[PDB]
Amino acid sequence: NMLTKETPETFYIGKLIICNVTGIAHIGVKTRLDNGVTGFIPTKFLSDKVVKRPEERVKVGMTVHCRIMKIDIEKFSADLTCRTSDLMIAHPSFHNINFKQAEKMMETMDQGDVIIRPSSKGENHLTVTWKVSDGIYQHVDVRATLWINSEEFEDLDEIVARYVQPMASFARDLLNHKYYQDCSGGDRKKLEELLIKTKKEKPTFIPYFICACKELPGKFLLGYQPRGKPRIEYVTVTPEGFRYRGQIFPTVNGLFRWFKDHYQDPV
């Protein structure tokens, strides 16, 4: 206490004391501490007695933090632990990850699960990714400009149950449609060639089909052949309903019942 100025009553067990190992006598690391206490780490601090020294557990030449378990600054010893453990149906999902690598973990999810992730700009941005269709995903780049408040970021449970859960419930109904098709995710080249082949078997009855677009997620596609010319009408799925010709339908069925008595105009 008169020369080194550090007694055992200051250093306690449980608190982390940074022990700088500068050398080793014969398997240990005997160095000095911050208060001049000669920190001699035993072989139990490195976990090796007949092998090389604790180079992975104690930094040779530098200071290595360890949990203080012995107060012997007057005895020329320092029981500093070299180990880091000695110092101490619509499922939600959480993250922090890369867009490419994120694509591989949302293919194992089935319809309905929503992952939360950051976004490529790497700060402030975040994105709500959900199962628009088989092989099609939405990436709501919230500031897809979905303007929100600042208070909601502390509770991440309502932005899904108010904007995406009803959206997914609305999107699932079209998947269970009687006339749904993949067409390679709505390839614009594959869709025009199907309507011209289905019209020839039954020229009187004109069928209709729905598809999602991989080229622009959240666009559904509704093609109909009033005559010998393919025609494509787009529709956006909204958190509150559907955006069809700028008219908002509360329920999934009123869209179809509005279409059955609107597609018979000459346009």
Partner 1 sequence: EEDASQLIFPKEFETAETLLNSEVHMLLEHRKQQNESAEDEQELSEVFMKTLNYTARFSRFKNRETIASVRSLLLQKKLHKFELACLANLCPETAEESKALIPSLEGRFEDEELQQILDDIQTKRS
Partner 2 sequence: GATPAYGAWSPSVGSGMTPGAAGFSPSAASD
Q: For partner 1, which is the closer residue by CB, 9 or 151?
A: 151
Least distance in angstroms from the C-beta of 188 to partner 2 = 13
Q: For partner 1, which is the closer residue by CB, 99 or 153?
A: 153
How far, in Å, CA of 165 to CA of 170, rounded?
A: 9
218 binds, options partner 2, partner 1, none, Cβ within 5 to 8 A by partner type: partner 2
Least distance in angstroms from the C-beta of 263 to partner 2 = 7
Q: Does 143 bind partner 1 (CB under 8 A)?
A: no
Q: Does 154 bind partner 1 (CB under 8 A)?
A: yes
Least distance in angstroms from the C-beta of 156 to partner 2 = 19
Which residues make up the interface to partner 2 (CB under 8 A)?
A: 99-100, 119-120, 127, 138-141, 144-146, 204-206, 216-219, 226-227, 229, 231-236, 243, 245, 251, 253-254, 257, 260-261, 263-264, 266-267
Q: Does 201 bind partner 1 (CB under 8 A)?
A: no
Least distance in angstroms from the C-beta of 158 to partner 1 = 15
- Overall size of the chain counted in residues: 267
245 binds, options partner 2, partner 1, none, Cβ within 5 to 8 A by partner type: partner 2
Residues 6+ apart with CB under 8 A from 231: 223, 224, 225
Count CA atoms closer than 13 A to 53's CA, side-chain side.
Answer: 17
Least distance in angstroms from the C-beta of 150 to partner 1 = 6
Phi-psi region of 23 (alpha: psi -120 to 50; beta: other; left: phi over 0): beta
How far, in Å, CA of 115 to CA of 120, rounded?
A: 15
Q: For partner 2, which is the closer residue by CB, 14 or 203?
A: 203
CA distances from 180 to 96, 102, 186 (A): 35, 28, 11
186 φ/ψ angles, rounded to the nearest 5 degrees:
75, 45
Q: Pick the closest to residue 20 from 5, 33, 37, 29 (CA basis).
A: 33
Count CA atoms closer than 13 A to 7's CA, side-chain side.
Answer: 3
Candidates 12, 76, 99, 153; binder of partner 1 (CB under 8 A) is 153
The binding site for partner 1 (CB under 8 A) comprises: 150-151, 153-154
